[PDB]
Amino acid sequence: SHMVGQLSRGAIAAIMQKGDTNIKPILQVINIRPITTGNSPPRYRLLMSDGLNTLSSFMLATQLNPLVEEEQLSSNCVCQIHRFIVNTLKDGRRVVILMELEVLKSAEAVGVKIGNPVPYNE
């Protein structure tokens, strides 16, 4: 019960504003899509939720591609992020690269979007 209490509420704002990387937040995957790479290996963009907010500017490190390609990491799964870095683009947007993560609960075991998160603004 209280499914939202499974997620690190407030982590998205903390990552995007304080830029603290010492945290190991538990987030839900809402959606995953490949992004166009020329002839580079595939790259995945994730829409993640901390229960309060969603954020669409997560990228998976390519070393984690098999998680997606063998379907252990998919929409609705709950993951703990163990290592990430934030990079800021020339235009001021920030991207969060997920380097290490652990799936705590598979999509099948969660089965739904937790809570009613709203998009994080900027």
Note the residues at the interface with ligand 1EK (CB under 6 A).
35, 43, 45, 57, 59, 61-63, 87, 89, 93, 95, 97
User: Which lies closer to ligand 1EK via its Cβ, residue 21 or residue 87?
Assistant: 87
CB 24 → ligand 1EK: shortest distance, Å? 18
User: Which lies closer to ligand 1EK via its Cβ, residue 14 or residue 16?
Assistant: 16
CB 21 → ligand 1EK: shortest distance, Å? 13
d(CA 20, CA 118): 22
CB 45 → ligand 1EK: shortest distance, Å? 5
Burial class (CB in 10 A: 0-12, 13-18, 19+), 93: exposed
State the sign of the Cα–Cα–Cα–Cα dihedral 61, 63, 68, 74: negative
Pick from 66, 61, 50, 23: nearest CA to 118: 50
CB 16 → ligand 1EK: shortest distance, Å? 12
50 CB neighbour count, 10 Å cutoff: 25
